[PDB]
Amino acid sequence: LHSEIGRLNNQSLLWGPYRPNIYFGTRPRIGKSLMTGLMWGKIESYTDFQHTVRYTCEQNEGMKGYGWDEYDPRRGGIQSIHDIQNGLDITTSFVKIPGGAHGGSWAARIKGTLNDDAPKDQKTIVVFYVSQEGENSELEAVPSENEFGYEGDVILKGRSEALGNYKLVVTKGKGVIPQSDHDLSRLRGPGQTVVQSLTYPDEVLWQAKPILFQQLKAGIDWLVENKYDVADPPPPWQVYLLANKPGSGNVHIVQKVFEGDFEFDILFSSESAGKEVTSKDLEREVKQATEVFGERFARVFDLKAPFQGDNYKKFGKSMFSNLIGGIGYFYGHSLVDRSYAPEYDEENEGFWEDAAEARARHQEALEGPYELFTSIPSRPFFPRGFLWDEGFHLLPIADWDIDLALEIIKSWYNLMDEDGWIAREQILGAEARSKVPKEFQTQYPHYANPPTLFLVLDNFVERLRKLDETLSTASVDNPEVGLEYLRRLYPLLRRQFDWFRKTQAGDIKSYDREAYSTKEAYRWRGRTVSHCLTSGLDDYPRPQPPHPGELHVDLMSWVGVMVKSLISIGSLLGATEDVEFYTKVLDAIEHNLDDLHWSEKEGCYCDATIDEFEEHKLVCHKGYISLFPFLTGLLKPDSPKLGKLLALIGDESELWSPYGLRSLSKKDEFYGTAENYWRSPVWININYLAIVQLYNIATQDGPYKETARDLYTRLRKNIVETVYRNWEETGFAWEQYNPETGKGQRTQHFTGWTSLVVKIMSGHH
Numbered sequence: 001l002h003s004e005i006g007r008l009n010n011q012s013l014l015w016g017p018y019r020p021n022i023y024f025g026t027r028p029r030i031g032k033s034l035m036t037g038l039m040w041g042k043i044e045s046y047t048d049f050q051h052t053v054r055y056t057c058e059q060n061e062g063m064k065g066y067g068w069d070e071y072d073p074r075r076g077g078i079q080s081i082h083d084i085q086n087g088l089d090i091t092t093s094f095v096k097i098p099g100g101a102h103g104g105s106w107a108a109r110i111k112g113t114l115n116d117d118a119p120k121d122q123k124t125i126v127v128f129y130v131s132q133e134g135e136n137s138e139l140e141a142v143p144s145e146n147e148f149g150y151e152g153d154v155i156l157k158g159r160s161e162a163l164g165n166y167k168l169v170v171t172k173g174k175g176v177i178p179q180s181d182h183d184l185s186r187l188r189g190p191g192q193t194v195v196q197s198l199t200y201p202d203e204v205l206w207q208a209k210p211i212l213f214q215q216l217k218a219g220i221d222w223l224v225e226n227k228y229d230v231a232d233p234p235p236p237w238q239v240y241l242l243a244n245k246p247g248s249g250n251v252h253i254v255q256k257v258f259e260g261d262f263e264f265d266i267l268f269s270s271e272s273a274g275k276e277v278t279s280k281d282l283e284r285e286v287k288q289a290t291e292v293f294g295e296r297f298a299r300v301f302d303l304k305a306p307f308q309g310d311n312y313k314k315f316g317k318s319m320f321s322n323l324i325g326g327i328g329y330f331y332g333h334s335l336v337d338r339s340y341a342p343e344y345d346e347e348n349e350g351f352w353e354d355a356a357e358a359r360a361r362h363q364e365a366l367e368g369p370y371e372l373f374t375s376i377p378s379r380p381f382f383p384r385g386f387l388w389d390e391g392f393h394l395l396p397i398a399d400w401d402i403d404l405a406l407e408i409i410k411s412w413y414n415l416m417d418e419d420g421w422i423a424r425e426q427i428l429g430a431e432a433r434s435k436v437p438k439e440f441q442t443q444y445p446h447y448a449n450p451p452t453l454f455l456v457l458d459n460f461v462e463r464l465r466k467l468d469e470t471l472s473t474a475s476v477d478n479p480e481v482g483l484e485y486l487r488r489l490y491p492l493l494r495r496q497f498d499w500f501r502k503t504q505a506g507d508i509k510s511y512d513r514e515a516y517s518t519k520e521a522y523r524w525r526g527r528t529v530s531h532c533l534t535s536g537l538d539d540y541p542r543p544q545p546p547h548p549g550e551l552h553v554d555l556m557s558w559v560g561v562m563v564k565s566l567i568s569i570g571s572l573l574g575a576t577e578d579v580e581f582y583t584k585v586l587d588a589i590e591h592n593l594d595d596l597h598w599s600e601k602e603g604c605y606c607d608a609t610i611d612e613f614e615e616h617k618l619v620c621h622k623g624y625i626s627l628f629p630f631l632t633g634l635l636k637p638d639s640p641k642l643g644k645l646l647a648l649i650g651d652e653s654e655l656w657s658p659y660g661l662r663s664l665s666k667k668d669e670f671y672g673t674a675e676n677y678w679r680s681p682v683w684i685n686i687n688y689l690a691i692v693q694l695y696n697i698a699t700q701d702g703p704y705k706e707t708a709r710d711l712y713t714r715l716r717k718n719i720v721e722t723v724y725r726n727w728e729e730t731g732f733a734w735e736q737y738n739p740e741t742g743k744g745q746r747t748q749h750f751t752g753w754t755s756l757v758v759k760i761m762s763g764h765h
């Protein structure tokens with residue numbers, strides 16, 4: 001039955017607008033295949049369009065906002081885009097129609113509306129760009145009756161091993177098409193939809209904007225050659241109308257010009273399915289998808305007081321839709337340094353200078369290709385897989401569609417090397433690379449990242465103990481199926497656990513350090529003088545200088561998180577030898593936390609180092625780091641240490657701000673210093689962990705029940721209101737929140753773990 005559910009899942013998920021790096025575009029979950037993309041831009045002059053055209057996502061003064069109003073990757077969704085610069089409000093509706101053997105059919109309506117500021121008679125160029133990769137695949141534009149282009153629908157007929165036979169239609173659509181009285185119309189027509197069919201080497205098909213501009217440039221060149229000049233020039237919008245040249249090729253550019261508002265439809269008809277998809281089909285399925293989304297949202301995300309209000313509901317559906325709507329499929333080579341230089345061992349004082357020199361040998365090389373299906377932090381800034389980010393992303397998604405979450409987990413785990421490493425940032429393919437400066441591309445196999453995907457597995461396990469609707473929860477409704485998934489995955493989790501122990505180990509035995517166990521101690525590789533990028537908390541203060549004797553409490557706590565999970569799952573698979581080993585490790589980490597990381601003087605957990613005189617020193621910077629054993633659920637609900645931590649959490653003069661917990665205490669000497677990335681701001685992911693854990697204490701008999709309840713109540717409210725106030729005033733979810741003013745700061749469109757706010761509002765952990 002497992003293989004059955006798997007086949008149906010493949011078929012359900014194959015098609016999507018899985019190109020979140022651009023405003024609107026589709027591709028299937030197949031590395032080399034058919035992809036589409038939307039471009040648009042006002043044209044007012046002879047030079048302006050190169051500046052106005054839109055394709056890849058950004059955020060600047062010219063763009064008010066954009067995002068998904070509803071989305072499910074199984075059904076589709078609606079996207080809004082508010083473009084100030086081009087004076088346009090765009091809707092993109094995408095929907096999926098199951099049937100056939102090839103992942104079904106889809107359709108999209110593109111609707112544009114001039115806003116109040118735009119000239120009523122603005123000319124807008126719209127382009128739909130289609131490419132196909134494959135050695136055996138074909139795609140052809142059916143030519144038009146008319147002389148110079150199309151009065152009606154453009155039909156592309158194609159075939160591939162992947163997709164079977166298919167037909168992609170770009171409808172005539174509604175809207176005023178400008179007509180030119182110029183002489184040039186004798187040769188190029190007065191104005192109409194036009195198509196160019198081109199062929200380039202597969203590996204450059206993705207560069208739609210440059211491909212396009214080279215054609216525009218060739219049209220203009222042709223004008224100048226044929227004596228169209230400034231003595232009497234054609235209208236701008238006609239200079240940038242391509243000559244019609246439909247045919248076969250691996251690239252097809254469809255171009256329309258509108259005056260005022262417009263709409264058109266894109267219809268993809270899988271031949272192996274029923275009759276072809278119609279515009280009538282599109283509207284019906286859109287209505288249907290919205291109804292289904294409505295119904296699911298209110299079961300899964302039942303917002304509890306005081307967020308029962310309709311304004312909170314809209315906020316929730318926006319945050320949730322943007323998170324899940326950011327799901328991408330990515331395909332290509334990664335850049336990895338596979339030298340395993342000895343300098344990366346960081347066993348020396350000054351190790352950071354050694355490792356810089358090893359990196360300057362530039363031994364890195366492309367490898368793969370790999371594929372990844374994942375959600376992302378940020379469409380405009382970070383449209384790619386980040387390992388510990390995904391652990392947070394998949395918590396709300398799991399609620400919505402557990403089967404979808406497990407697919408993404410599976411996708412991540414299939415990237416793991418034989419050693420147990422997964423690169424923390426997955427930049428797959430040249431397209432992906434185009435958004436990342438060269439300095440930041442290379443991944444290193446000694447760099448770790450918090451194992452947050454373990455949290456999502458933890459939720460899966462609890463749910464397991466305790467057609468699209470059927471498929472979304474198939475893996476928990478069918479315990480046979482759930483266990484098979486775990487059986488297959490379990491080895492990989494174990495591998496990763498061992499990888500952590502081998503590569504991220506700290507040094508107990510080489511110093512004057514007594515502790516309960518001689519095994520358990522951890523040090524993040526990769527730190528520089530001011531940074532520990534691999535821990536996830538970029539610039540959180542750490543022992544100065546970095547030192548091979550350092551021990552990091554956050555890292556050890558992450559290991560704790562992993563062992564607990566391995567016990568849960570290994571129990572369920574009857575891996576008895578395995579569970580007993582885990583149990584010794586849990587026991588040891590519990591003691592070692594206290595023996596090496598607990599500070600009695602300061603009353604919290606701390607990182608450690610080694611003295612100028614070779615002795616173990618605690619280094620305390622009160623902040624998120626300090627509470628890690630708590631945030632990870634390793635402290636017994638009755639512990640005196642827990643109490644001391646709750647004092648810190650609640651203390652206004654330390655971590656507690658009106659707007660959530662500060663990353664670092666106001667009392668710390670490094671508060672609001674340097675880049676201030678994690679040296680004061682409020683971050684929703686860590687606040688989420690605090691909230692979930694406080695609620696855990698509040699719902700059990702114990703000494704801290706009442707205290708925890710008070711803190712849970714206020715923190716939940718403070719975080720939700722902060723994210724919401726900002727969302728109201730700005731339209732955006734932000735990366736982090738200022739603890740003095742409550743304003744969102746750093747990057748916009750962070751959906752992104754900011755979206756956990758949906759889970760916070762709905763409660764019942």
Ligand SMILES: C[C@@H]1CN(c2ccc(NCc3ccc(CN4C[C@H](O)[C@@H](O)[C@H](O)[C@H]4CO)cc3)c([N+](=O)[O-])c2)C[C@H](C)O1
Binds near residue numbers: 382386435437440
């Ligand atoms: C669109 C493109 C953006 N570019 C660009 C890309 C990358 C980087 N640094 C790498 C980087 C990557 C991710 C984050 C976010 N965030 C940080 C949290 O701290 C982590 O915990 C969390 O893992 C993580 C993910 O959310 C922060 C920094 C920089 N840069 O630093 O100058 C610039 C420049 C070009 C011009 O434009």
